[PDB]
């Protein structure tokens, strides 16, 4: 790894030059480069409705694109789609397997995606003249459990991550295309841009890789943590993304320079985090912890602005609606809570 | 409330009713794990327990048994082990006739001397503080057909005793059973198996009925 050592060192120098450059024009804190900002007052949220329906712990919750429909995934073998405003269930999909750990909802309202712990992914069709929900494809070819499944701007290109590879595909043909690689540990969080042509990921080692679908090679790699990576997300501008690990410290990174911006942390919080979202205004940030609460953390300052603690177990899912009206959270207590 | 949202309420009520019935059909289901260790006779208890994830279902004495078998997943067990809590009992299988050969993974490790390594990792996990561990022992005939020629002293150097089937069998059962770190609420079981049938399913049936007694005692206000 001699040369690696040399060029990684060059890049650390680069990084140091960028840092030198960072320290040059910036306190780097990027907080004192905001010392003139005005603090934001406490935000006390309130529940709106509690979402029943499941019997076991909830392992997935993806929002729709009209900010109206919601899909959740439980461990009983059930994917449930309903209507939030009114808290009514629209459909109820059984599954051949019962060990799913993630779900996706196409940005067209026509298909959903589920898969976990069975090596095979399944794309389900909803609009059928037949009148019932049936399988449309069953992607196979992986040698492990599927961590995350998503849809790429169309109901014809899905994107995945399982044991150790992130692979792309094509719903019709049913064949892989542009199979990503370059990881060492086990991928467990997959994102993508608003005008999605570049996307980032997070395996078991303290690293994160951003991918570009034209060629299928890492555009950038991010490090800095000392534990796993549970949940990563982006920034509404697309030039930033929020990430999380199993060490209570959430970290925010930027693409142009490639190094952290702020760190969030308090002594009273020694457990881990398990989801991070972001509210359209760019100020607030909601983090679901293992302390049965979801502390919100204004992203410009480093202070708490509310404790939306209402759960009775560890929170495994946390989602803000496309239009930023509200947020949805979900723990292992089998109730989804809507906080507005 | 609009002559159309009322039907959406009726449809939602029908979906909820169907989901509650299917979940009740599945509570009265005993779920076992079959976490083994390599080619250690797993396919055999399975081989005759009936008469990625592998699913086995059988019934006996008006009780339905489904077994989850996982050997293929060569991934971080620590990230999917937290999807298996709530299980009644973790059948764990040890081949008695495995102290002689050498595992293909390394010439230093002893098949068994790892066998009890996998046994210790799975028994002290934080997600398994109160769960019974069924233990089976395979291939007793191989153990009593070469135990004269080969000294059990080759492994476990602290052994001081003869080479009879009874003494060796007692020693290996105690040094396997004495890995538990909390004897207050977690129990370990032991049984000897061979090609003989009808003498292995019934042990599984006894262990599982002891687990159900403890659960009802715990959730009724007595224990």
């Amino acid at each position, epitope marked *: 790894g001699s040369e690696l050592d040399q060029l990684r060192q060059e890049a650390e120098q680069l990084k140091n030059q960028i840092r030198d450059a960072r320290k040059a024009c910036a306190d780097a804190t990027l907080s004192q480069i905001t010392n003139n900002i005005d603090p934001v007052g406490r935000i006390q949220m309130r529940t709106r409705r509690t979402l029943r329906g499941h019997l076991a712990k909830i392992y997935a919750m993806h929002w729709g694109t009209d900010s*109206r*429909l919601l899909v959740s995934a439980s461990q009983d073998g059930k994917l449930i789609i309903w*209507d939030s405003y009114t808290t*009514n269930k*629209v*459909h109820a999909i059984p599954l051949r397997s019962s060990w799913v750990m993630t779900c996706a909802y196409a940005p067209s*309202g026509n298909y959903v995606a589920c898969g976990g712990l069975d090596n095979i992914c399944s794309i389900y069709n909803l609009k059928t*003249r*037949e*009148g*019932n929900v049936r399988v449309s494809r069953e992607l196979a070819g992986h040698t492990g459990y599927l961590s995350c499944c998503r849809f790429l701007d169309d109901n014809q290109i899905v994107t995945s991550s399982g044991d150790t590879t992130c692979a792309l595909w094509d719903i019709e043909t049913g064949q892989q295309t542009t199979t990503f690689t370059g990881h060492t540990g086990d991928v467990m969080s997959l994102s993508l841009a608003p005008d999605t042509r570049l996307f980032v990921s997070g395996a078991c080692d303290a690293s994160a890789k951003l991918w570009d679908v034209r060629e299928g090679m890492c555009r950038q790699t991010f490090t800095g943590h000392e534990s796993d990576i549970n949940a990563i997300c982006f920034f509404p501008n697309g030039n930033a993304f929020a990430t999380g690990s199993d060490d209570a410290t959430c970290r925010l990174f930027d693409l142009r320079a490639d190094q952290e911006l702020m760190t969030y942390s308090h002594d009273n919080i020694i457990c881990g985090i398990t989801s991070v979202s972001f509210s359209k205004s760019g100020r607030l940030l909601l983090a679901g912890y293992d302390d049965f609460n979801c502390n919100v953390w204004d992203a410009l300052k480093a202070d708490r602005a509310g404790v939306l603690a209402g759960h009775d177990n560890r929170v495994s899912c946390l989602g803000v609606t496309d239009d930023g009206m509200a947020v949805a959270t979900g723990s292992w207590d089998s109730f989804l809570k809507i906080w507005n | 409330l*609009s*002559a*159309e*949202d009322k*039907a*959406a309420a*009726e*449809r939602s009520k*029908m979906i909820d009713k169907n989901l509650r019935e299917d979940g009740e059909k599945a509570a009265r289901e005993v779920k076992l794990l079959l976490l083994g260790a390599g080619e250690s006779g797993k396919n055999t208890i399975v081989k005759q327990m009936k008469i990625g994830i592998v699913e086995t279902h059988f019934t006996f004495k008006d009780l339905h048994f489904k077994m989850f078998d996982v050997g293929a997943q060569r991934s971080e067990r620590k990230k999917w082990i937290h999807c298996f809590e709530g299980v009644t009992a973790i059948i764990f299988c040890v081949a008695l006739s495995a102290y002689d050969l050498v595992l293909a993974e390394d010439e230093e490790m002893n098949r068994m001397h790892a066998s009890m390594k996998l046994f210790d990792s799975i028994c002290n996990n934080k997600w398994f503080t109160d769960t019974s561990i069924i233990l089976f022992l395979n291939k007793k005939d191989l153990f009593e057909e070469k135990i004269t020629h080969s000294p059990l002293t080759i492994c476990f150097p602290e052994y001081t005793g003869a080479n009879k089937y009874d003494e060796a069998a007692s020693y290996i059962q105690s040094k396997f059973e004495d890995l538990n770190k909390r004897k207050d609420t977690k129990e370990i079981y032991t049984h000897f198996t061979c090609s003989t049938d009808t003498k292995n399913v019934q042990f599984v049936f006894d262990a599982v009925t002891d687990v159900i007694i403890k659960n009802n005692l715990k959730d009724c206000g007595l224990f």
Partner: single-chain antibody, 232 residues
Framework: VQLVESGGGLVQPGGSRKLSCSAS????????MHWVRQAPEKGLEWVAY????????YYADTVKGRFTISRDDPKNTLFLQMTSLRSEDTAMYYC??????????????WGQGTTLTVSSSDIVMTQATSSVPVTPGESVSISCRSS???????????LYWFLQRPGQSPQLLIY???NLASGVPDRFSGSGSGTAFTLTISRLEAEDVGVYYC?????????FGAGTKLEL
């Protein structure tokens, strides 16, 4: 998918007769059913409705009590047993399949009916127009009028459009105004507010010849409207 009815013919006053509708090609237990009667050279009429699970069977206004109607799920059969014959009920009868949830399209698929013959408040909603001569390539605008604000606090209105080719059963073109149906070209469009409701056709061709209908779904009694025919 296929749905076929049977049980018509000639009856006599005071008597009784049942109609059986068989459906094949889809899951009958997860859909709701409606009955629409259309007399010879007249408009459409709603008869009954039997939701999934047989919870809420409704009935008509002038047919209530006289009629009865049921369904058999194992056989996917629907039994509508009619009581009196008053000779004013000589009409074809069509069955209609519908489904209701967020984003559903009620009255998708219809079916040829039997030609019964007999030996011898609701939100009023009419269409002023009775006939319009049309040449190919000419844009045509049809207008419907109501007597109540079809909007609701939900934020949507309940209006449905239907077309009937000569010699066959009707089909869906425009459910709720700003929504287009499935299997229909993009030529058609619809709009309106309050009471003024309008349907527009940019380019019209030979095949576009038929009888047009507009109907309400805000309240329990379903009210249809007369036909703005289009001859050529």
């Amino acid at each position: 998918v296929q749905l076929v009815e049977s049980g018509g013919g000639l009856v006599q006053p005071g008597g009784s007769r049942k109609l059986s509708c068989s459906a094949s090609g889809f899951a009958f237990s997860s859909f709701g059913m409606h009955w629409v009667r259309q007399a010879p050279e007249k408009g459409l009429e709603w008869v009954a409705y039997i939701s999934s699970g047989s919870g809420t069977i409704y009935y008509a206004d002038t047919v209530k009590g006289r009629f009865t109607i049921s369904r058999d799920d194992p056989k996917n059969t629907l039994f509508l047993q009619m009581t009196s014959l008053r000779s004013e009920d000589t009409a074809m009868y069509y069955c209609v399949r519908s489904i209701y949830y967020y984003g559903s399209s009620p009255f998708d698929f219809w079916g040829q009916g039997t030609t019964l013959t007999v030996s011898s408040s609701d939100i009023v909603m009419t269409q002023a127009t009775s006939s319009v001569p049309v040449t190919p390539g000419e844009s045509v605008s049809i207008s419907c009028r109501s007597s109540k604000s079809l909007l609701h606090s939900n934020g949507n209105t309940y209006l449905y459009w239907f077309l009937q080719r000569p010699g066959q059963s009707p089909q869906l073109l425009i459910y709720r105004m700003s929504n287009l149906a499935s299997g229909v070209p993009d030529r058609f469009s619809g709009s309106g507010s309050g009471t003024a409701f309008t349907l527009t056709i940019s380019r019209l061709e030979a095949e576009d010849v038929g009888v047009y209908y507009c109907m309400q779904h805000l309240e329990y009694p379903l009210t249809f409207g007369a036909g703005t025919k289009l001859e050529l």
